[model samples]
Each structure stands twice: as structure tokens, then as C-alpha cells.
Target: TTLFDPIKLGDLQLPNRIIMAPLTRCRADEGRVPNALMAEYYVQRASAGLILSEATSVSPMGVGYPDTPGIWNDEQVRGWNNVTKAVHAAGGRIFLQLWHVGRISHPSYLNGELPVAPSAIQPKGHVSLVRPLSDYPTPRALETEEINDIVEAYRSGAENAKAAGFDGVEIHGANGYLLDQFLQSSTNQRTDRYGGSLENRARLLLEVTDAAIEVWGAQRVGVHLAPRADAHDMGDADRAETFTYVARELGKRGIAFICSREREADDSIGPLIKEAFGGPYIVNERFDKASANAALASGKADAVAFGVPFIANPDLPARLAADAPLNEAHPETFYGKGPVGYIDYPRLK
Candidate 1:
């Protein structure tokens, strides 16, 4: 019954094990403040047990693209406050995901400025935008002093999340972001304390988690780590070693929970991590009702986060509860400005 049963994560009690995954909806302002549209979009999907908001940059340097929201500035925080208020009014609990793109960013996105990373290497892929897909440039390596500033940026962002009245904050240590860049040996070839061994590679993520917990308290903090199959520059050679150690270390801190982006529904990483960390585990990536139930029943995950499904099925939990069919998400309207694919999705009757 764990799949449909209630569970506690940090200071909030989830009604079910269904979590709305943090999805990037580029509907904010140029300054990275959440627009009214974003507020409405999230409020509509408040039926989920918990909503982990989209990746929000912690600082200007952390900015990767246009209209991606942020938490560092007062205006940004105030804008997010509006979102939190709306979600609370709907009886929903939400957590902000703090993020930074590192080498994955483009100069065009950063006011013609180069992105920063642990090394001066550039990411292999391009980021799609409104106009066209632009090639990512070689990022400048962060000096020791710059690294401290970046850490402070995350610290300040956590404080801003508290100011915005969020229940907790999920440090975005997943994907190929800034923190993940430091964690991967391919992206980070530095000869410093933050590079070399697995411990050294994971140092930045752990430090950031500590900083966020300092601001939001350990009980109110969580982390999202996606050990993708083809991480390219983001994948560590010793994926299991790096992640297991990271989970155990996080468990030692007594944080709220750890979320993993599983490659498949049958992936064993989630259960292995749950056993290793001994805390709440959220399984993501690809999942449906049967798979999610199987995971929970088999003790593989404490919760399941639905990404694309939550977009179209605003009342996803209800539909899942009733064994109703899910609405398909329109891929075209996943990003950009508009109401047609934004806040116009109607809940199933």
C-alpha cells in the first residue's frame, strides 16, 4: 500500500507517492522572474502530492537561457512568492529546484558573456531556443575565488527560496548542470581539491547541499541526481561508486530525501540507493501506474515523480487513483510563450 499510502518528506506530509517532477517551462521574464502565467500553470497542477518546480538559476552567471526563472534577486523571489501563495491556496506543497547550467549555457543567453565551469571545456550539444539551436561555447574555468562566489550564490538562493515561502528546496545536482559538471571526471579535469578522485568530484555538490540545508534546515532539503546512460561530458566513469558514496554521505547529514532519474522502470539503482541512503527515495525518468506501483511494492522507491504526464493531466493523481486514461502532452507547446499549451489544459471530468 506504500504506492497509495501517505508519507512524510521533511516538514510536509504527502497524500500519495506521486510527485510532480521539476520541468523547465521557459515562461518567465528576461530577468528570470516567474510570470503570472507560470503561477497559474503550477496552481492548476496542484493536485499532485508534491510539486518540485522547474530548475531555477541561483544567480545571473547561473542563467542558461531566456525566461528561465531565478531565485537570487528580490524581484525574482517576490515573483516566486506569488507562485507559492497560489500553490498553498490550492493545498499543495512545493519545492524549488536551484540550478546552474555551467558549460551547457550559451553566450547569447548570458548577455554575450561566456559560461563558467570547473574546466574550460565546452559541452558537446546545442540548446534549442525560440529562434534556432545555438552551439555552446567553451566555458571559462572558475578560479578558486570564483568557486567560492558560486557557492555563495547557491547559499543566497536558498535564503531567497525561504523568503518566497517555499516548503523546501531541491538542489539541482542532476543532469549536466554546473554542480554535475564538477562531479564528472570528463567535464572536470582540474588538479584541485574539487577534482581527481570521486570524493573530490562530489565535493561541490555536497558543499552546496550543506549550504542549502544551512539555510532551509536538513529536514527541508533534498537533491536530484540523474546518472544518465549517455551523460557524454556529464557521466562519471564510476557512476555507481560516485552516486552510492554521494547518497551515503547525504544520508549522514540526515537530509530529507534523495531523488534519482532512473533510465527505466525496472532500474535497480533506485532500490540500491534507498538501501544505501536509508531515507526517502524518489524515482523518476520513465514511469507509469503499473511501474510506479511495482517500484513501491518491491521497495525500490518511496515515491514516483511524473514529468510529461503532469503537464496534460493536471489532476494526474486523481486519474491514477481512478485508473482513468491520461491525456497526452503536446510536445510543440512544451516551451515558449502562449496560453494554448501553458495554462489551458483542462482537468479530466
Candidate 2:
């Protein structure tokens, strides 16, 4: 099969295997609500087989960055409803990517409260979102009882995504976010059931996935994973086993798909993840049209998620299919408010 071939990813029938990766453009308005500009931006790229929206916080406590949208509350849901409506109007399928930034946050974003994590170990580096770049403080260890609340937050987020007219929801279990923090040994230092062994470390992600599945159904849910990415000061003593176990569990639950970001220079554990997942797998990270198609042709990936490329080329799937030159993304304009890099991309004529 080719990159342009039709494929069924769970319940979604994608016209092409070119999926839009979840990208944090940080363009939401004050109150972390999605706005008209965001809708316009998503509508422009509606040609994607499926669009995983920017990492969206599931609750207020989940907000760590400036202007990133949230999925809680009625106002936020309505805002996303606008975006979903516009995307569907353009004949596109979009999935809300649910997120919660554990210790990757500063007090400023948390209203002077320390961020929460499985353990209190502070991650190295400052949060670029805050002015003057605030250093990360030791986050408060989450009470075991509070774990249930977080799962409820994810379930509510999933319900909100459905209310907003999304076809599916993608759990942001990747990068170095909250779920990843719990899954990795380097971050999770808890002796509680949520920490230590592989099963314990993976408990949070699995529970959150189940919550999402409860609201969206297994076929309407997906999860993102970053097996070898340690950019957020994240590492696992047994990287392959940790993620493989998570993948296998997710597979057993019959989730829609697992999209993982695999670095070429890093040891390729993606094949192991796919094997364990035993379902549609989407691979992201530095893949151009040639490599993306090659991955699909070789069955290494059921689909490919384009991140920065989709930011610059609104009509990315069409451009890739037609061998058109891609637009270069402007890094400086990628993460803030305004239309410069968000919605002003020039599409193929």
C-alpha cells in the first residue's frame, strides 16, 4: 500500500494515510479557550486523513503553557465545537488530543501552586511559557486518592470531545507529559502502586486510556507514545519493556491506534512497539514524503503523522501525493498568538 491509499484506522475511514500530528501552536485565547482563528487554521488543513489537534489540557490543573487550549468547561467545549464544525464542513476528521502536564509546569501557570507529579523530583530547565522563564520547582506528589480525580478528568475530557463533535479522541500519553512522567522510571520515584514495576508505572496511562475508552469507546480512542525521546529529562531503565508492556495492554483493550514518535538516531524500538500493539500504528518524527511512504510501503507504519510539515503546508496530504514542494515552517512564529505562522500557510494552488 502507498501513503495515499485509503486505510481504516479503527472507526475512522481515512482517505489517505497522511495524518496531521498533534502540534502545540499555543494559539488559544485567554482562559485557554479555542478561538475562531484556531478554527480557521484547522479548517485549512482539513485534507489530512485524520487530524490530532494540538495537545489540549483536560482540566485547569493541566494547563502548563501559554494559550494552549483546554477541554474542560462549557465555554472551552463550545470553542472546540466551532473548530470541529469547520473541519467537518471541510470534509476532515479531527481527534481531540487529551493532555495533562505533570511536573513540566511552573507555579505561575498553576496559580502559585506547585505542579503535581507521581513524585516530587523537579525536572531540569525553565518553563519558556512564563516571562523571564521560571525555573521548575519541586512538584507536589499526587495523593493516591487524587489519581481517581485525574482519571475522571480524562473521562470528562473525552465526553467533552464527543460533545464538540469530534470523531475520536487521542490520549496524550507521549512526550514527557503527565502520563509519560508516571510511565518512566527516571521521573516516577513513588513506591506506591503507581510506581516501581513496569505494570505499576504503566497503570496511570492504562487507566486514563480506559477512561477515554469509556466515553469514546475503544474504536474511537488512540494513544501517543515517545519510547526513546528524553527531551523532557525523561528516561526509563527498561525503555523497550516499559513501552512494549503499555502497547500490549493498549492492544488488549482494543484501542483504535498507537501513534509513536520514533527518532532515527535512537535505537529503533518502534518495530517492537508495533508488534506488541498488533493494530494500526502511526509513526512520527522527521519523516519527509519519501520516508513516510517508504514506512507505509514496508508496513513499518500503518500511517504517518506529519508535525511541522503540516504546520507549513495546510494541504499537506495533497502536496505529498502530488510531489509538490513543501512550505518551510517559521520556527519563531510557531508557538505564540497571531496568524503569521498559524493560519497563513500557503496551500498548493
Candidate 3:
């Protein structure tokens, strides 16, 4: 009864409580546009109550990896239109996850230019573009004038997504991306209005949310915040205060929902967020049927999203419905070219 219950998310009615968390599989073609293959991929998993698409760059500058999809151009809009049309035809609901990588990007992916971030700091990790792993190149701090331009890029991407027939868009403010980069105190060390105290660090995320609301209305918009351990020395301090403030601000704007990525299954951040932001809240991370059911039963979360499990099980909702066994995902082909790991996984008979 818990898992099968219908839930209301903004203007859409979810047939089930299951949500397909956005997974980044580099399937888009050149110019970073979704193609027929992607359409097939999403349509195959349409049985889930809602499908939040993989991270899609809001602008060309937002691209961090080769073949990562974009929502800034007309061709991209048309391509996404095809994907949306396919999902709708299959009787599925979908949302686009709008993104900007910030310093997580490599110069090779940015036309030999430096990646942009709140400051000139480089995230301490390797980035895999079309090529193999390489050190993250230092990013240049964004000029005050460039900040407004990036905001407009987010707005334009939302417009393109709307034209592509998406029901809504989720601003990717998590996982140490552009918005998260600004939200994190370690990454955003500036004296201007965009950095310093908690309000300054939170300025970019709130502004981006406002811009997205202007394009897609409050109900049709969602925001994702990954308050996990710091990936780039960003999440080292005042974790509770930072995210609580963000959730509260989003609530004031009357945004649709807030999705939190919990690295550990027993993390208590979800309930804290639900209290801060009084709306539908989705919890993501590693979740099995028992844990998911308990989460819903305890009122810790309104919905649950599956990542790796969704990849190997297209008929995940049905599997949950019938209590079927799931296929183990092949780690080898997770990022390789071709369908070995992309779309070749068989569904339960």
C-alpha cells in the first residue's frame, strides 16, 4: 500500500511513489543534443512515476564532458522534443535536470578555454572528458558581468526545455556543480555580493531559482541540493545551516519540491529538509525495497529515487510490483561507447 500509493507533485499526479533519479550516461550526440537512442532509453523506463533526466548543460559553457547534452540551442530543443514526445506517447511523465558544471569541467571540453567557477580554485579530482582521466585544470573566477550572463543562460535553457515539451525542469544545484560551487563556502571565497557570509554564498542558487521560476512558474520547478561530504573541500563547514537556509528560501518562493542526495542510507538530512521546505520531498541514494518502504512509512520522505538499480532494471516499477529479482549492472560498460551497458540490459520476463 505504501509503495503503490499515488502522490501529487506540483501539477502532475504520480501513478506510483517511485522516481527515476537522473543518471548521467553520455548518450547524446554531437552538439550535445538528445537523439533517438536517448528517447528509446527514457521511454523504456516510463513506467516509473516520474523520470528526472540526466544532467543537461544549460549552456555551451556549462558543458563538462564531451557528448553531454545541452538545452541552449534550437536543435537541442527539437531533439529533446522528440524524447519528450516519446515519453508522453508511452504515458510517462518527465523533467529535465538543468545543469552547469562550473570547475568540474576540463578545458578540452570547453574549446581550449578555462572552466569558470566562483573563484579560481580547481576541484581536487580527475575529470574524464572524451579522453582519459586528467588533472582538473585551474578555473578562472567569473567576472561580475559574466555572472548575469550565466543567469541568462540558465533562463534561456529553461525556455528551450519548455519548447522541447518537457513538463518541468530541475535546477542541478548539487554535486559540486556551478550552483553548488557557489553554495559551498570553500569554493566561493569572494568579497563581493556573491560570496562571504551564508547569504552571499547562497545568492547564486536563489537567483538561479528565481530565473527558472520566471521561465517555468513555481509549481513546475524543482531544485536539487547534494549536502553530502565535500567533494572539492566545499562541504566542510556548517552543513546544516547552509542547506537549511537554502530549503527555507526555496519554500518562500513556493517551488514545487526539493530533492536531497544522501550518500548514506540512514542519513537524517531528509527529515530536516522536509521540515525546512514544506513541500513534496524526494530522497535519493542507494535504496532497496525495504529501506524505501520504511522511509515512506516513517514520513522521512515523500518519494524515493533509484540510480544504479534503474540502469539495470528498466521495468523497475514492475519488478517492484511483482517483487522480481534484478540484474547486476556491468561496471565495465558503464561509461564506454556503445550499447553494451547503455541499453542492452534485458528486462524481467
lDDT of 2 at 273: 92
Estimate TM-scores for all models.
Answer: 0.97, 0.98, 0.97
Pick the TM-score winner: 2
lDDT of 3 at 174: 93
State the weakest 10-residue window (summed lDDT) of model 2.
260-269
lDDT of 3 by residue, 80-176 (tens): 9999999999999999999999998887788899999999997886786445668888999999879889999999988898999998999998988
How far residue 179's Cα lies from its native spot in candidate 3, in Å, is 0.4
lDDT of each: 0.86, 0.91, 0.87
Q: Write the per-residue lDDT of candidate 1 for residues 1-349, one digit (tens) a residue.
A: 5557888997789988899999997889767888788888889888888899999999888877678899999999999999999999999999999999888787877788899999999787776672576668899999988888899999999999999999999998888889989988788898888898898888999999999989988889999988653553576787777788888999998899898877564445666677778899999877989988987887778899999999888889988989998888998988877687878877878
